[PDB]
């Protein structure tokens, strides 16, 4: 059967499922971006942009 390192070659001649893989990758990246921001907001302290700016946090 396919070795583990080749499972995604089943998309090479399947434009539809290639698009579906790409859509899923784009979803995961957009989701991360949303999740990361929400974590950052839950932990960010905005009270001092002088001595405790975001880059310190």
């Amino acid at each position: 059967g396919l070795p583990w390192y080749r499972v995604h070659t089943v998309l090479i001649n399947d434009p539809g499922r290639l698009i579906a893989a790409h859509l899923m990758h784009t979803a995961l990246v957009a989701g991360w971006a949303g999740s990361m921001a929400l974590y950052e907001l839950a932990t960010f302290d905005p009270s001092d942009p002088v001595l405790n700016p975001m880059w310190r946090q």
Partner: protein, 122 residues
């Protein structure tokens, strides 16, 4: 005009103090041989400002504006007291009674809620 409860109920006007015409710029004579009183005093806050806690390094805390969250429950009214005429000519109001406190919660940026007893007691 002469309004009635049923005219006002639920409108938000029960929390508003009475107002005076743009043309009421006369003057009330004070007769120093006379005894005087405030028969109604009405205070209607319009803004609540809170001093931001100036950080350690500080420089100068400002009074920051706030969002009222407790609705139209803020006004002081039906306050009475005598108006004394002092002998240097000054007047002094000494509160006796009235609805002279309201609990009020405002909210600062970031979500800190700040309750306070908005009041003129005594």
């Amino acid at each position: 005009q002469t309004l009635t409860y049923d005219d006002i109920v639920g409108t938000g006007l029960a929390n508003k103090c009475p107002t005076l015409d743009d043309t009421a710029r006369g003057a009330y004579p004070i007769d120093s041989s006379q005894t005087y009183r405030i028969a109604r005093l009405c205070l209607q806050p319009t803004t609540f400002l809170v001093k931001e806690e100036p950080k350690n390094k500080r420089q100068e805390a400002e009074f920051v504006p706030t969002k009222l969250v407790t609705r139209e429950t803020t006004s002081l009214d039906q306050i009475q007291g005598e108006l004394k005429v002092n002998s240097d000519g000054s007047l002094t109001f000494v509160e006796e009674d009235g609805i002279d406190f309201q609990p009020v919660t405002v909210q600062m940026a970031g979500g800190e809620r700040i309750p306070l007893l908005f009041t003129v007691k005594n």
